[PDB]
UniProtKB/Swiss-Prot annotation:
Protein name per the record: Terminal nucleotidyltransferase 5C
Effect of K128P: Decreases substantially the interaction with PLK4. Weakens binding to PLK4. Abolishes the inhibitory effect of TENT5C on the cell viability
Residues of the full protein shown: 14 to 343 of 391
Any GO MF annotation of the entry: poly(A) RNA polymerase activity
GO cellular component: centrosome; cytoplasm; nucleoplasm; nucleus
Lineage: Eukaryota, Metazoa, Chordata, Craniata, Vertebrata
UniProt-annotated location(s): Nucleus; Cytoplasm; Cytoplasm, Cytoskeleton, Microtubule organizing center, Centrosome
EC numbers on record: 2.7.7.19
Keywords: Cytoplasm, Cytoskeleton, Host-virus interaction, Nucleotidyltransferase, Nucleus, RNA-binding, Transferase
Induction record: By type I interferons.
Task performed by this protein: Catalyzes the transfer of one adenosine molecule from an ATP to an mRNA poly(A) tail bearing a 3'-OH terminal group and enhances mRNA stability and gene expression. Can also elongate RNA oligos ending with uridine molecule, provided that the sequence is adenosine-rich. Mainly targets mRNAs encoding endoplasmic reticulum-targeted protein.
Length: 325
């Protein structure tokens, strides 16, 4: 675990104070929100409702952009983590109430407003999870930049490459925003701690500067692991060693087909993926598909020959469509 220097701390302040437009599906106007503003409003109403917030973290590539500016992963993924306890289903409802309440805050035009109408205009994704170890709720906003409000009680420590496993604790800066008489300066700024959900922070930090692909948890890799790996490859990241990465590729491919046996379901996953990370980048769409096609063709085991040609055809035909339309 490391301490964010002034260069990193200052860049975090910009991200948290960056005005992000949220599209409104329907007649609803574009919301001019702010990462700092959302966190403050959400955490406040949560504390008021009787829900303690132990931590507010910053995940995604936004965290990586803070530690290393313009690292190659971009800064489109504005992910917020709220370490919040979730006992009864009632608390899950309160979380939804708070976010929708905070949505009402960033709006002066004539229109019908309700917690339902705000959901069907600003919310694009909603995930409820309450299992053995996994226990969290997720709310996303319209992407046209995408903000994801995640509320983690306890997670099974999901798999992610070391490059995008960074989380930055905002509590020290949230304290600063609420109780300061002077703006954040170089000679007077709060101490912000960044962490890595991978292992050694300094080891993951070196991977972000040298653009290295690595992981120590191949055991917990699931279906989406293949897509993340291809996303790193299309963004010019290289494996720590080409010898062992050949083993991972086979594992990622094998685990991909297990979670997505039906080709129709594969297409749904790919069509939805290409529109997320590469919305307005057609050549990046094609490049990503060709990277994926390379991995599947090389690392699909002989016994899975049927799914290979079936998927390679899906990838090829997917490319031919984005190459025409």
């Amino acid at each position: 675990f490391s301490v964010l220097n002034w260069d990193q701390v200052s860049r975090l302040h910009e991200v948290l104070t960056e005005v992000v437009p949220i599209h409104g599906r329907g007649n609803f106007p574009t919301l001019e929100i702010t990462l700092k503003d959302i966190v403050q409003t959400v955490r406040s109403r949560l504390e008021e409702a009787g829900i303690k917030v132990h931590d507010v973290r910053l995940n995604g590539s936004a965290a990586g952009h803070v530690l290393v500016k313009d690292n190659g992963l971009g800064c489109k993924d504005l992910d917020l983590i709220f370490h919040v306890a979730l006992p009864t289903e009632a608390e899950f409802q309160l979380v939804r109430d708070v976010v929708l309440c905070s949505l009402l805050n960033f709006l002066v035009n004539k229109l019908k407003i309700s917690p339902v109408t705000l959901k069907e205009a600003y919310v694009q994704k909603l995930v409820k999870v309450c299992t053995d170890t996994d226990r969290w709720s997720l709310i996303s906003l319209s992407n046209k930049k995408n903000v994801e409000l995640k509320f983690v009680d306890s997670i099974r420590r999901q798999f992610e490459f070391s490059v995008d496993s960074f989380q930055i604790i905002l509590d020290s800066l949230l304290f600063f925003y609420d109780c300061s008489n002077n703006p954040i300066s170089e000679h007077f700024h709060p101490t912000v701690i960044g962490e890595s959900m991978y292992g050694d922070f300094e080891e993951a930090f070196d991977h972000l500067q040298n653009r290295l692909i690595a992981t120590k948890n191949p055991e917990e890799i699931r279906g989406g692991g293949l897509l993340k790996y291809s996303n790193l490859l299309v963004r010019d990241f290289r494996p720590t060693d080409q010898e062992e990465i050949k083993t991972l590729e086979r594992y990622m491919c094998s685990r991909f087909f297990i979670d997505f046996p039906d080709i129709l379901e594969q297409q749904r996953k790919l069509e939805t993926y290409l529109q997320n990370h590469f919305a307005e980048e057609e050549r990046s769409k094609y490049d990503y598909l060709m990277i994926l096609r390379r991995v599947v063709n090389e690392s699909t085991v002989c016994l899975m020959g049927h799914e290979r040609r079936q998927t390679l055809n899906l990838i090829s035909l997917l490319a031919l469509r984005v190459l025409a339309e």
